[PDB]
Amino acid sequence: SMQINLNSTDPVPSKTPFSVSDADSYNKKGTVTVYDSQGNAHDMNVYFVK
Amino acid sequence: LDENRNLVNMQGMQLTGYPATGTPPTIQQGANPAPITIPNTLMAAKSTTTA
């Protein structure tokens, strides 16, 4: 569970579609972590294009 | 600054932060804030492509 709120003065991210971390390609970034059965951890990035 | 110039308190512990990265450095608000370093670095010889 992760919740976001936005203001719509944002443009199209000029470089569309989104890509991992190129700076113009997302209106916001989000991060959250998950787990698996080995006991590892992954980190997830969440991005928004509007 | 520590001797790596990672910012630390009286007991060497790293003052984590949201990293301005990319070029120009852009605030990664919401990335895991982690140990922040102020190391001196060359001012990149980057072109005058548009002036």
Automatic annotation (TrEMBL), chain A:
This is Flagellar hook protein FlgE. A flexible structure which links the flagellar filament to the drive apparatus in the basal body. It comes from the Bacteria. It is found in: Bacterial flagellum basal body. Belongs to the flagella basal body rod proteins family. The chain holds residues 153 to 202 of 403 of the full protein. The lineage of its organism: Bacteria, Pseudomonadati, Pseudomonadota, Gammaproteobacteria, Enterobacterales.
